[PDB]
Amino acid sequence: GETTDGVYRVMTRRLLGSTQVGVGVMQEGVFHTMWHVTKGAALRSGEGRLDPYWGDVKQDLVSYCGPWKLDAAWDGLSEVQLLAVPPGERAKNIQTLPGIFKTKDGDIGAVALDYPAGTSGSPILDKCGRVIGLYGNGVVIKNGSYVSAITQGKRE
Amino acid sequence: DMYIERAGDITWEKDAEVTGNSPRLDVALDESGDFSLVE
Ligand SMILES: C=Cc1ccc[n+](C)c1
What we know:
- The structure holds two protein chains of two kinds.
- By secondary structure, chain A is an all-beta fold.
- Chain A is 3% helix and 45% strand.
- Chain A has two domains: 6-64, Thrombin, subunit H, CATH 2.40.10; 80-149, Trypsin-like serine proteases (Thrombin, subunit H).
- Chain A is built from one helix and 15 strands, in the order E-E-E-H-E-E-E-E-E-E-E-E-E-E-E-E.
- By secondary structure, chain B is mainly beta.
- Helices cover 0% and strands 46% of the residues of chain B.
- In chain B, strands 3-4 form a two-stranded antiparallel ribbon.
- In chain B, strand 3 (24-29) and strand 4 (35-37) form a beta hairpin.
- In chain B, 18% of the residues are buried.
- The structure holds 3-ethenyl-1-methyl-pyridine (A1AJY).
């Protein structure tokens, strides 16, 4: 199948027509997405198969063909871009200054951008084009607005 | 049966649309990976 680096839509034919359930990143031969997009199922890429390699429900992340490769982190000061890939629509870059999720185990960057559930797994990048996390696991705040964590894995 | 389809390159766009605010929120993360607001 297609192994070229880049952003990909994750599709299913199980429901009506062809439905986009999420998005992921191909980097260094490994496919990276959020756990809630695939639930750990195998994926097809053309005539090839991608098998899960690592995953964790609590982090809400999963990697295919190899270990998690993304290790860039938000610097805590600069604006970033969500490379949003919405269902049936072209990939588009959106610049924003992240907010913060403060937790008992430390602080996490967060992006206050509202896209359909099928955009889950879209990458958040720094000014060097490095993926600092994936968009799509977050919360609904007081005014009904959506805020996603910048979710990043660990490179072993 | 899930499949993937290329959507583009991962690159920073100069002069992209700039939007969104920067809220500071107290949150909790449960064992199922769900975030919730702490009040
Ligand atoms: C991008 C994913 C998303 C967007 C809005 C709401 N939720 C739960 C998830």
